[PDB]
Amino acid sequence: MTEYKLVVVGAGGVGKSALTIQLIQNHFVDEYDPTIEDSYRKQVVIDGETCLLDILDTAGQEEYSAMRDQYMRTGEGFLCVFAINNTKSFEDIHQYREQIKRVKDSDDVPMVLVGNKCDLAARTVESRQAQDLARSYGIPYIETSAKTRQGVEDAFYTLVREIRQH
């Protein structure tokens, strides 16, 4: 079985950990415990092929911004997460994209744009706006809810497919 190194990045509080734990444990985390650096493994069959996913769950808080290079070097693919009710988290996306490109020195890094918390009615980032950005990056855009599981497997397994075809 092939091993895939996935990394989840994005501003603090957008739900990177909740997305990851929903995927790993089928459980919604209600608490907001800021991450420093966590690691998860998941054996899963995707498109009839058995994979081992290593998922690095990263810190969104700005106080940890100087420690990103090290995890971007190892990552094969990145989930770039914002919250659809948080415009600033959407604006932070481009900084993650550019840093990943810089660190890996490549224009061709497997990536998925994720708009999380799509279960909430009070949206402030419109899908079209996020879709336009995703197209400009050449990557898919998937809306998710770590709470209901909507789009969660789709987001992670799409990233796996992009690493596969890379």
Partner: protein
């Protein structure tokens, strides 16, 4: 490159040498540590250059074999308390002229050494509390020290995580599933809902038997902590104290196997016994479908036991397609579980692994590798041995994450939780009984085969193992 504090005031600034650390030849792009002093292990556990969360799990899972919990806390507090450098010459000259110093080196050291190391010390504390809380459960003073340390960390940079970890500790002291699709309907056969007194091997639905055992066996699998495994404590004198979840799980497996054997040899009538064995193989079939490998081996072990394996007249009448199902399951265990290991690594979870080979591999890893390596007069902790153990506990944990999408049936669950085939009898006498029963119902050659009266008053025909579905 950053200058470091003197090793005289901060021990974790000692240069790497083969006297205090040895690396594996193979990278991955971070170094792999073969051996080191505790000081060097803790420095790399909280290294300023890179993160390695897997090292944290590995260290926290296995450290007790070379370092006491109280000592680990002292060492990481010591790691956390990093001296800042004094102003440089350029800073000095600026200060002497009444100007604000640039403090370029101080700021770089804070940003690139102090804050990553302190954050990673906090990450060890976080992981320690969330995933290895038993150290604190078993030693309240250690917990008091942790609370004090965390609670008195100052500075705006660590504040979010310090406040968080304080809350996490408090929660842990006083201490859910979403799918995806709904679970299939509970299946019933001769025994109807609520009629627990009629529940038995042939009266429950074979599908629902496999499902409820898989739920039970999954819960038992999922409850085993690494603390029940490291140090091989499940094999030692205090195993009931240190490994109660592992042993409950193993005892369930043993009791189910013995129950299958008992159901078979206490059915003296050949035709009825054939029905009993055939039903057990159908339950095996559903176990395979559910990836319940513990359940699969429960059946296989029963069919290969001395009382059952010798029942040639029974085996003869088992449909050829069930023989193949049984033989295929048996072949999983052949050549040291070669096909089992390949199948486990290829299926889509949830599953229930067979725990037995994990125990053997952990025991042998620990027994066959030295605690320390001797190098240039020094004793270094053999950390590759600990990594090998943690790779096994890590794999165990990986299969503990995925829950089964199956509905609990409380009465059937209870029926199997309370299964007690041995009764008040000791193992040897119960086991001798099973074999004598076997000799009775199918005597050795050249004794001819006796006949026996039937015992079941309800129909023997199986409802099969394909699930049904009303609107």
């Amino acid at each position: 490159q950053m200058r470091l504090p003197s090793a005289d005031v901060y021990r974790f600034a000692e240069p790497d040498s083969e006297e205090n650390i040895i690396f594996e030849e193979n990278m991955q792009g971070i170094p792999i540590i073969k051996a080191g002093t505790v000081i060097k292990l803790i420095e790399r556990l909280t290294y300023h250059m890179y993160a390695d969360p897997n090292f944290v799990r590995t260290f926290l899972t296995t450290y007790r074999s070379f370092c006491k919990p109280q000592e680990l806390l002292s060492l990481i507090i010591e790691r956390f308390e990093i001296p800042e450098p004094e102003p440089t010459e350029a800073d000095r000259i600026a200060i002497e002229n009444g100007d604000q110093p640039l403090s370029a080196e101080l700021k770089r050291f804070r940003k690139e050494y102090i804050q990553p190391v302190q954050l990673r010390v906090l990450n060890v504390c976080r992981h320690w509390v969330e995933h290895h809380f038993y150290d604190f459960e078993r030693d309240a003073y250690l917990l008091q020290r942790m609370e004090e340390f965390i609670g008195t960390v100052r500075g705006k940079a660590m504040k979010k995580w310090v406040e968080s970890i304080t809350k996490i500790i408090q929660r842990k002291k006083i201490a859910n599933i979403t799918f995806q699709s709904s679970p299939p309907t509970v299946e019933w056969h001769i025994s109807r809902p609520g009629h627990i007194e009629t529940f038995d091997l042939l009266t429950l639905h074979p599908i629902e038997i496999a499902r409820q055992l898989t739920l039970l066996e999954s819960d038992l699998y999922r409850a085993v902590q690494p603390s029940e495994l490291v140090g091989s404590v499940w094999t030692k004198e205090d195993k009931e104290i240190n490994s109660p979840n592992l042993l409950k799980m193993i005892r369930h497996t043993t009791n189910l196997t013995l129950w299958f054997e008992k159901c078979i040899v206490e059915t003296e009538n050949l035709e009825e016994r054939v029905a009993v064995v055939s039903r057990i193989i159908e339950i095996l079939q559903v176990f395979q479908e559910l990836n319940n490998f513990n359940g699969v081996l429960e059946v296989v072990s029963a069919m290969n036991s001395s009382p059952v394996y010798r029942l040639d007249h029974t085996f003869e009448q088992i449909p050829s397609r069930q023989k193949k199902i049984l033989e295929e399951a048996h072949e999983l265990s052949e050549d040291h579980y070669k096909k089992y290991l390949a199948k486990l690594r290829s299926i889509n979870p949830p599953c229930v692994p067979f725990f037995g080979i994990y125990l053997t591999n952990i025991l042998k890893t620990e027994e066959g590798n030295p605690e320390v390596l001797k190098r240039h007069g020094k004793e270094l902790i053999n950390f590759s041995k600990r990594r090998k153990v943690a790779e096994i506990t890590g794999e165990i944990q990986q299969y503990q994450n995925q829950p089964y999408c199956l509905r609990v049936e409380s009465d059937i669950k209870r029926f199997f939780e309370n299964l007690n085939p041995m009764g008040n009898s000791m193992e040897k006498e119960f086991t001798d009984y099973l074999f004598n029963k076997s000799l009775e119902i199918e005597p050795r050659n050249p004794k001819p085969l006796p006949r026996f009266p039937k015992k079941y008053s309800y129909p023997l025909k199986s409802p099969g193992v394909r699930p049904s579905n009303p609107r």
